[PDB]
Design a protein around this ligand. Sequence first.
Ligand SMILES: CCCCCC/C=C\CCCCCCCC=O
Length: 138
Amino acid sequence: GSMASQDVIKNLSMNFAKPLEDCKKEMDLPDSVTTDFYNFWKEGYEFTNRQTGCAILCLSSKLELLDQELKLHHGKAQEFAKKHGADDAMAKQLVDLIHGCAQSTPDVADDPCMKTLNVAKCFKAKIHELNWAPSMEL
Ligand SMILES: CCCCCC/C=C\CCCCCCCC=O
């Protein structure tokens, strides 16, 4: 049921967010990214700025979910999801949701941080629509 699917997202999210303090230190990210992560799954919450996108790219990179062009590694993102409780079907759906979101998000400004932040917003909305958003912070 919806709560068990939210717990997979919850598990994925906490694991994804673990090295955030290291990404903050390494890239001199501002304290607002920690707030944005705390509120990541809050309905209606609007992200501060592109630095939250920089934080998402760093976390992805640390989990080696990015390829050389700072784009999602589909196979590695799938396996990440499965190691944190997703079945093959759910893992594939999540990768499809991110990919769709990347495709419907043009990077006109050559700004991966902004683009990643817009991909994240698109992804968060899709998860909310599936009622797969947990009520717990990162
Ligand atoms: C559970 C926490 C998930 C937070 C949102 C992560 C979304 C995208 C990661 C960034 C990768 C896609 C952005 C680059 C476009 C190409 O692929």
